[PDB]
Amino acid sequence: AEINQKSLELELLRLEKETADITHPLYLGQKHQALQAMNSHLEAVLREKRSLRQR
Amino acid sequence: QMLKEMEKEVDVVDAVVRNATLNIPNLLISRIESEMHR
């Protein structure tokens, strides 16, 4: 019985590790940040379109 | 991968995006006197 419990635990942990890059909050959070930085930059570029065109 | 490759360009773009007493100098006087007829 004890072996069976630990075996299940192991199986569960293995499944979680294999799918962490797309599922875990930590990794997903990093991707969000990178995307927000670029958004802001593009907003700025669009706001100064006239000046940039003139240049 | 696309966001990482565009970092340098973003930087360049960001760089762009971000009582009347008159003393007339002798040099100009000399010029005006030499061309005074004109």
A24 to chain B nearest CA, in Å?
20
A5 to chain B nearest CA, in Å?
41
Which chain B residues are closer than 8 Å to A34 by Cβ? 3
The experimental method behind these coordinates is: cryo-EM
This PDB structure is determined at a resolution in Å of 33.0
Size of interface A-B (CB pairs under 8 A): 16
Torsion of CA B2, B7, B9, B14, to 10 degrees: 130
Of B14, B6, B8, the closest CA to residue A48 belongs to B14
**Distance between CA atoms of A48 and A51, rounded to whole angstroms?**
6
**Distance between CA atoms of B9 and B6, rounded to whole angstroms?**
6
Which chain B residues are closer than 8 Å to A44 by Cβ? 14, 17
Give the CA count within 13 Å in the CB-facing half-sphere of B16. 14
Under 8 Å between Cβ of A55 and B24: no
Cα A29–A32–A37 angle (5° rounding)? Answer: 135
